[PDB]
Amino acid sequence: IVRFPDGTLIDTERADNLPPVCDLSTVSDRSLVDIVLALPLLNANGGNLDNGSESERPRRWKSERVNVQELAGHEQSEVAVLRHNLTLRMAHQENAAWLTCPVTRLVRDAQGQWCRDPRFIPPLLTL
Amino acid sequence: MKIYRPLWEDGAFLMPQQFQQQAAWDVHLADSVARMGLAHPWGVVAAEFDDSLLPLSRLNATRLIVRFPDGTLIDTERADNLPPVCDLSTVSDRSLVDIVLALPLLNANGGNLDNGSESERPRRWKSERVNVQELAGHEQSEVAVLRHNLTLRMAHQENAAWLTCPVTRLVRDAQGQWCRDPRFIPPLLTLSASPSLMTELLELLHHLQARRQRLMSMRRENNARLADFAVADVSLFWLLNALNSAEPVLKELLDMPYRHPELLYRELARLAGSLLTFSLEHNVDAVPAYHHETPENVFPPLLSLLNRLLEASLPSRVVFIELKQKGVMWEGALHDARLREGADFWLSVRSSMPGHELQTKFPQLCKAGSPDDVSEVVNVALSGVIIRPVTHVPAAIPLRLENQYFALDLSTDAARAMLDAGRCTFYTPASLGDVKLELFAVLR
Amino acid sequence: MKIYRPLWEDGAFLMPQQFQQQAAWDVHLADSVARMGLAHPWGVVAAEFDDSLLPLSRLNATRLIVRFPDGTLIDTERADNLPPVCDLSTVSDRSLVDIVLALPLLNANGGNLDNGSESERPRRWKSERVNVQELAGHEQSEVAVLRHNLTLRMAHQENAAWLTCPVTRLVRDAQGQWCRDPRFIPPLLTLSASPSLMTELLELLHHLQARRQRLMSMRRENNARLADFAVADVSLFWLLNALNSAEPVLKELLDMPYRHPELLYRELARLAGSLLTFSLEHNVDAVPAYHHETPENVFPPLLSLLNRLLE
Amino acid sequence: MKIYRPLWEDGAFLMPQQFQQQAAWDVHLADSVARMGLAHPWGVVAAEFDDSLLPLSRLNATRL
């Protein structure tokens, strides 16, 4: 559950997804690996992603179809909702996406074992 | 570039080069229409960025209607073209950086898009698939449209292969943040870009209307329906003629955007050409030339020249000089050598005597010291000075206060030795009381 | 004529009669854009010749760009071929020949010319098969390119089913040789097409800046003369108002390439019209009316009117 | 002002009063989440003028 400096709420209870990170052993080092969360910039004319029309500017919306019911009645049907697009990039790659927020910092053990270090501090909204 | 327009009569196999060479000819024809009157290449219509992203440094554009020198139209609302986001974390030199929009050219033997190949030569075309509706009432299908391969680069990189036009300037702020100057101007096809320029040009005209209404009142202050026989009207009727013409011309241009700057440049070059005749020591070299390559100080000195012309007093005057000396014999300087033509003395003070006994209580009310070799008046005086107390005051002397005025007569030699000196002193040692002195020399 | 628009309905096949109609419509759109700034039909952008074949009497060109009064543009750097070489042989004993370029008039029943076999009707649109394809990665195949059919008509060019536009004027030298005359140039869409005019207009302006200079050192050097009412100084203050005003507009227009010459005419007319009733006893009709369809016996007698006033 | 909250069941059909009241209710939640902006009345965050029209005795704003 984060918020972004433009005024954008992200919950991963409702309006959720996240793909996992494929490799960590693209790095031969431990102390530089810190994972960040990215949500791409607002394009003032285009919008979501309904096709394979991958420009140099990614999108940030999707489409999705699930079941929704709240009305006075006991029947559910299917309506199309809107979900954001997140991924977990790294700090030293690029900034054409958004990040502006760390979430962790990974250091390895001498037995080749990545661990989350206990002295990391994200920028905080709450204790 | 060997533009070949095809012809169709019958039986010709269709092939893309008939169409590609056709559409390129319509641009070149439309280019030659514009170069008849204006003699200007293209420029920048509008370039608006996003200010909220600057201290978290990126750079995003919103609208870029930039027009290139060959004749190409880039439009972002009607052709869906935005460059990728320019980084600023690659620059730590915080002096200043310039952002300039670019586009490649080299299509002599194929400037195209082949994504299955790499090259160190850039390319200016790309391909995109959308579903465009027929304008006859039917279902859409998929076509393949083109998008220009725009990019943002910096001025201190290498820019050989591209075709550039500058859009903004970045400075660094006191807290270590980035911000934008309002002082620069891109090359304009319209005044609507760079709104700082529209800010100055409007307040120039509001400054112009301020000067008129006082001068119409100053015509009403003499009511010149007749022969005045002075210079005071012939500059007055003249200065209105420079001002009455330019106002109903410079109004309609600064009502609107979308004029070229050249139409505005001629009226500002004509108006400053007519006011220059009489005030400044400057030649016509001060009015600068038009440089639409980069408009770096073609407009700001031209506006700065106009504001100094708009004080412009009307010279049938009389000198008001403050007589400064640390002793009780106050003294001024800087006498005009012109003043041996028509010299006349009606010098004054401003005192605190409750009646006209200050006549007697100005005890040296004869022979105050003119030349450069008088140190005190109570021991060194002239020969041939009669100081008349003036209680009936003639006109043409503003700010007038009676029972403070007096005249100063001299010889024919005593007037010349003062003017060749340039200095003159005052008679009563009580000038350090509630007394404030003035100078006076009106033309005869 | 009748100029038609096509309609790209689905299920409407293909005719080459269509594409000719659309392509001859934005050409008409180019005029309505342009006819918001025009008095009289158009002229010459540039024209350059090769005079080496004059003792062997022949005349041929090197570089030629002319626009025509129906929206036709002729470009020999990009679009068209050169006209064929002219022969002066039948006019070997005369004195003055005026040479115009020509394209034939077009009727609404014909088209191009079939190989000269039907030479009762002069017709344009020669074809040529050139292979230029290289905007994707290959060059190979061959298409049919249009080329215009230009002539050069010399002494009885008044027999014209042709649109004409003059380019040059031949005179006999006293050794019998034909030579190019440096005289008035057939009309302009520039000032780059007349190296005599660019030479002559500098002699106007450079003469203009020095009379201002001489007037400046008379009065600014004397602080009394800055506001005097002498009968010379009132005229001299008025006369500085004339020269200092219309100078920087003209320096803009003369340090400049191509621009349509009527815009120059509205700036020379004021400077003529200001100075005229100040130092003369003559008619206001000394300022000549602009005539563009003529070969401009206006623009040289206008300059001779100014040069006598400035001294 | 009797700010009504509209009701969408399976037969709720469309009127302009549906939407205007709904837009008014969320403005009303902007006040009652302020427990300091009720402790002083409502503010002014930017107000910038021009003085050039004062010799004409005119006046016009720039930012409000």
Side-chain angles (χ1 to χ4, degrees), chain A residues 1-94 96-127, chain B residues 1-333 336-346 348-444, chain C, chain D:
Chain A
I1 295 170
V2 301
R3 310 279 297 271
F4 281 160
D6 300 330
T8 299
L9 194 145
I10 295 297
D11 191 349
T12 60
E13 295 180 354
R14 75 286 307 269
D16 54 350
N17 194 358
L18 186 63
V21 178
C22 67
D23 193 4
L24 299 178
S25 292
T26 60
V27 186
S28 68
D29 190 2
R30 67 175 175 96
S31 61
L32 296 171
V33 175
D34 45 355
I35 309 300
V36 297
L37 177 64
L39 177 67
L41 270 297
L42 181 61
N43 194 359
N45 297 317
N48 54 0
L49 189 150
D50 284 334
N51 51 1
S53 291
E54 295 86 5
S55 67
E56 295 85 4
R57 296 167 63 86
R59 312 302 184 96
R60 72 176 181 179
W61 289 347
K62 295 292 185 184
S63 181
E64 187 69 27
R65 297 187 68 86
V66 291
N67 291 319
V68 173
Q69 57 90 21
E70 195 59 37
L71 52 95
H74 298 281
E75 292 182 354
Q76 57 183 354
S77 67
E78 178 181 359
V79 74
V81 302
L82 181 64
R83 291 180 183 271
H84 286 92
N85 190 5
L86 297 179
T87 187
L88 301 184
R89 298 183 70 184
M90 287 182 180
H92 57 273
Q93 297 185 0
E94 282 300 325
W98 180 253
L99 50 143
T100 57
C101 57
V103 290
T104 184
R105 182 180 291 171
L106 293 174
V107 297
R108 84 174 71 252
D109 196 2
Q111 306 298 321
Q113 303 294 323
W114 293 104
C115 65
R116 295 187 285 115
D117 55 349
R119 299 190 307 276
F120 181 76
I121 294 170
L124 295 173
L125 281 179
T126 61
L127 293 173
Chain B
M1 297 299 107
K2 293 288 188 180
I3 295 168
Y4 296 152
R5 62 182 186 272
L7 85 166
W8 299 275
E9 184 174 1
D10 194 1
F13 287 170
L14 298 177
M15 207 172 179
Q17 290 83 15
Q18 297 180 359
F19 286 144
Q20 294 180 356
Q21 294 289 322
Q22 174 63 46
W25 173 250
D26 301 336
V27 176
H28 177 73
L29 177 61
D31 183 79
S32 176
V33 179
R35 287 183 182 272
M36 291 188 287
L38 295 176
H40 189 273
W42 296 91
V44 176
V45 178
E48 299 175 358
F49 287 175
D50 193 1
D51 286 329
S52 65
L53 298 174
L54 294 174
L56 48 96
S57 67
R58 282 92 164 95
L59 182 62
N60 191 5
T62 58
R63 295 173 62 196
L64 290 175
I65 303 174
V66 179
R67 300 304 304 270
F68 274 159
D70 60 354
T72 310
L73 171 47
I74 300 298
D75 194 4
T76 64
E77 298 91 2
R78 297 190 182 96
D80 196 2
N81 303 320
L82 285 179
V85 175
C86 179
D87 190 0
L88 289 175
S89 66
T90 187
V91 172
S92 68
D93 191 3
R94 297 295 183 91
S95 299
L96 74 162
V97 69
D98 285 336
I99 296 299
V100 52
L101 178 61
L103 187 70
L105 289 176
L106 293 178
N107 49 6
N109 297 320
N112 44 7
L113 184 61
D114 191 1
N115 289 320
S117 176
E118 295 291 324
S119 177
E120 70 271 15
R121 293 296 183 270
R123 282 93 59 85
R124 72 183 291 166
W125 281 354
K126 288 176 68 174
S127 72
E128 294 297 327
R129 305 291 186 92
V130 292
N131 297 321
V132 189
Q133 189 179 0
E134 180 178 359
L135 291 172
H138 281 167
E139 293 82 1
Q140 70 269 15
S141 64
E142 178 179 357
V143 304
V145 302
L146 60 92
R147 306 292 190 190
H148 293 281
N149 194 1
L150 293 173
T151 180
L152 283 173
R153 294 171 67 88
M154 297 177 187
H156 67 278
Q157 292 180 356
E158 187 67 31
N159 294 318
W162 290 266
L163 183 62
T164 63
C165 182
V167 291
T168 191
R169 180 187 295 171
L170 290 177
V171 294
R172 195 262 303 166
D173 201 357
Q175 297 180 356
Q177 310 300 321
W178 296 105
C179 63
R180 294 172 57 195
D181 284 338
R183 293 183 178 180
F184 82 111
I185 44 174
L188 302 177
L189 291 178
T190 173
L191 293 171
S192 67
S194 178
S196 301
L197 183 62
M198 290 292 287
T199 304
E200 299 181 357
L201 288 169
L202 288 173
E203 292 178 352
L204 183 67
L205 190 146
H206 303 298
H207 186 279
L208 193 71
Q209 295 180 354
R211 185 64 184 272
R212 291 175 65 248
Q213 296 175 356
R214 293 176 65 191
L215 288 174
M216 296 304 294
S217 178
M218 290 177 69
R219 185 179 180 181
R220 289 190 294 265
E221 196 171 3
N222 292 322
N223 297 316
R225 295 185 300 275
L226 47 89
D228 298 332
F229 184 66
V231 72
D233 60 347
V234 74
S235 297
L236 181 59
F237 286 173
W238 169 62
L239 189 60
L240 288 174
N241 286 316
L243 295 179
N244 279 318
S245 67
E247 184 187 2
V249 176
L250 290 175
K251 183 171 172 63
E252 294 87 359
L253 299 180
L254 293 181
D255 289 333
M256 294 301 294
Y258 294 151
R259 305 291 191 184
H260 203 272
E262 292 168 348
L263 302 177
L264 186 58
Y265 178 76
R266 284 201 295 270
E267 301 297 324
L268 298 177
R270 181 178 289 117
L271 182 63
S274 64
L275 294 177
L276 190 63
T277 66
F278 80 122
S279 296
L280 287 174
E281 70 275 14
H282 299 173
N283 202 359
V284 76
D285 294 332
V287 175
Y290 188 68
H291 282 281
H292 63 272
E293 295 86 3
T294 59
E296 179 180 2
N297 278 315
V298 51
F299 285 96
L302 179 62
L303 296 175
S304 298
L305 190 66
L306 286 172
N307 284 316
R308 288 187 297 271
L309 290 174
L310 290 171
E311 281 76 5
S313 295
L314 280 77
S316 178
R317 62 182 179 178
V318 54
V319 293
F320 291 158
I321 310 299
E322 186 169 4
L323 286 78
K324 285 295 184 183
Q325 181 60 255
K326 295 178 183 179
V328 297
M329 299 290 103
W330 289 359
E331 182 177 0
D336 190 1
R338 183 178 64 88
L339 295 175
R340 66 182 181 272
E341 177 180 358
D344 194 3
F345 291 157
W346 301 96
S348 68
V349 295
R350 194 183 72 189
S351 178
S352 68
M353 187 68 74
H356 59 280
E357 291 183 354
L358 83 165
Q359 178 184 3
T360 60
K361 303 298 181 183
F362 286 163
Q364 296 86 20
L365 201 65
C366 61
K367 293 175 287 296
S370 74
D372 56 355
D373 51 357
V374 51
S375 65
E376 292 182 355
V377 180
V378 297
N379 57 5
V380 182
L382 272 73
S383 183
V385 173
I386 297 170
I387 296 173
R388 300 178 184 272
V390 176
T391 64
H392 182 75
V393 180
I397 303 169
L399 292 168
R400 67 178 187 268
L401 297 176
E402 291 84 3
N403 289 319
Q404 295 297 322
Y405 286 173
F406 62 98
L408 298 176
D409 194 0
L410 278 78
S411 296
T412 64
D413 197 0
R416 293 173 290 174
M418 190 277 289
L419 288 172
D420 295 332
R423 50 181 57 90
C424 180
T425 191
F426 181 73
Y427 57 97
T428 297
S431 67
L432 296 175
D434 199 1
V435 177
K436 294 296 182 182
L437 275 68
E438 295 177 355
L439 198 68
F440 195 88
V442 73
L443 188 146
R444 287 179 287 168
Chain C
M1 288 178 67
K2 301 294 182 183
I3 297 166
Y4 291 161
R5 294 187 181 97
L7 199 151
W8 295 110
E9 185 177 359
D10 195 359
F13 297 151
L14 277 94
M15 282 175 280
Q17 211 277 326
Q18 290 182 353
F19 294 95
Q20 299 171 356
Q21 290 294 321
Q22 181 183 3
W25 169 248
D26 50 356
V27 178
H28 178 70
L29 275 171
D31 281 329
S32 66
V33 174
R35 287 183 185 273
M36 307 174 77
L38 177 62
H40 297 293
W42 283 329
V44 177
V45 175
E48 289 179 355
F49 283 156
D50 194 358
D51 53 356
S52 66
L53 294 179
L54 263 60
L56 302 176
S57 178
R58 289 293 181 271
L59 185 62
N60 199 359
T62 60
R63 182 174 180 265
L64 184 63
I65 296 167
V66 176
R67 196 178 180 90
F68 278 161
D70 60 348
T72 304
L73 183 65
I74 297 301
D75 192 358
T76 56
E77 290 184 354
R78 292 179 178 90
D80 293 327
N81 288 319
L82 292 169
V85 61
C86 180
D87 194 0
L88 286 80
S89 63
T90 61
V91 198
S92 66
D93 195 0
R94 285 183 70 186
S95 67
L96 295 175
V97 287
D98 294 330
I99 294 172
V100 304
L101 186 63
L103 283 181
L105 293 172
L106 179 61
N107 56 355
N109 289 312
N112 55 359
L113 193 61
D114 190 4
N115 299 318
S117 65
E118 293 176 351
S119 65
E120 65 272 9
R121 292 168 58 194
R123 294 294 177 269
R124 56 189 180 181
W125 292 358
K126 292 182 178 180
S127 67
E128 187 179 2
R129 295 174 65 94
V130 186
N131 49 359
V132 166
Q133 286 182 340
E134 59 274 12
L135 295 179
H138 65 272
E139 294 178 352
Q140 290 92 17
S141 175
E142 193 181 11
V143 294
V145 182
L146 193 147
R147 296 286 189 179
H148 294 92
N149 192 359
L150 290 169
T151 64
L152 287 170
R153 297 172 68 91
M154 49 186 175
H156 292 286
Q157 70 272 17
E158 64 270 11
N159 303 317
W162 304 89
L163 289 175
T164 60
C165 186
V167 291
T168 191
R169 292 88 56 204
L170 269 301
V171 70
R172 295 296 295 270
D173 197 0
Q175 291 86 17
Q177 187 65 45
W178 288 278
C179 293
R180 292 188 295 175
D181 192 358
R183 65 176 183 178
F184 51 89
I185 291 94
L188 300 173
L189 266 71
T190 173
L191 293 174
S192 67
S194 296
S196 64
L197 266 66
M198 296 298 289
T199 305
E200 187 172 1
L201 290 174
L202 292 175
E203 289 181 351
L204 175 66
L205 182 63
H206 175 74
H207 183 268
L208 187 62
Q209 299 178 0
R211 182 68 187 272
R212 182 185 66 85
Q213 181 67 41
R214 184 180 178 182
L215 288 172
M216 182 178 175
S217 178
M218 291 178 70
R219 191 186 69 193
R220 173 64 70 187
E221 300 294 328
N222 193 357
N223 289 321
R225 293 177 69 186
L226 296 176
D228 197 0
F229 197 67
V231 301
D233 289 331
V234 174
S235 293
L236 195 145
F237 177 74
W238 190 87
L239 190 63
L240 277 178
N241 197 4
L243 297 177
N244 289 313
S245 175
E247 178 183 359
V249 181
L250 292 174
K251 189 180 185 295
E252 179 67 29
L253 297 175
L254 291 175
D255 284 328
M256 189 184 288
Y258 54 92
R259 182 181 289 273
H260 193 276
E262 293 185 359
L263 189 61
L264 178 60
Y265 176 69
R266 287 201 294 264
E267 303 297 328
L268 287 171
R270 290 193 183 96
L271 186 60
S274 64
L275 296 174
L276 190 140
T277 62
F278 182 69
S279 297
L280 296 181
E281 61 269 13
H282 309 290
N283 194 357
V284 184
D285 289 331
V287 174
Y290 177 74
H291 293 287
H292 179 80
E293 66 269 13
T294 65
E296 300 179 356
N297 53 4
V298 173
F299 197 86
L302 182 63
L303 294 174
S304 177
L305 179 59
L306 296 178
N307 295 319
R308 190 184 64 192
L309 293 174
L310 296 178
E311 185 176 1
Chain D
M1 287 294 173
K2 290 181 181 177
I3 301 166
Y4 296 150
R5 286 178 284 178
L7 189 273
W8 289 284
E9 62 176 0
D10 297 334
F13 55 96
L14 304 178
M15 276 78 72
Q17 303 95 13
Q18 293 286 110
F19 297 101
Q20 293 178 354
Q21 305 295 319
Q22 176 60 45
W25 179 257
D26 292 330
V27 176
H28 186 75
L29 287 175
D31 284 331
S32 68
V33 298
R35 279 77 182 266
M36 292 75 168
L38 292 173
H40 172 68
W42 284 258
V44 167
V45 309
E48 187 176 2
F49 279 168
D50 190 3
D51 54 356
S52 67
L53 289 170
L54 297 177
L56 291 175
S57 296
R58 299 289 191 272
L59 186 60
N60 197 359
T62 60
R63 298 175 68 188
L64 292 176

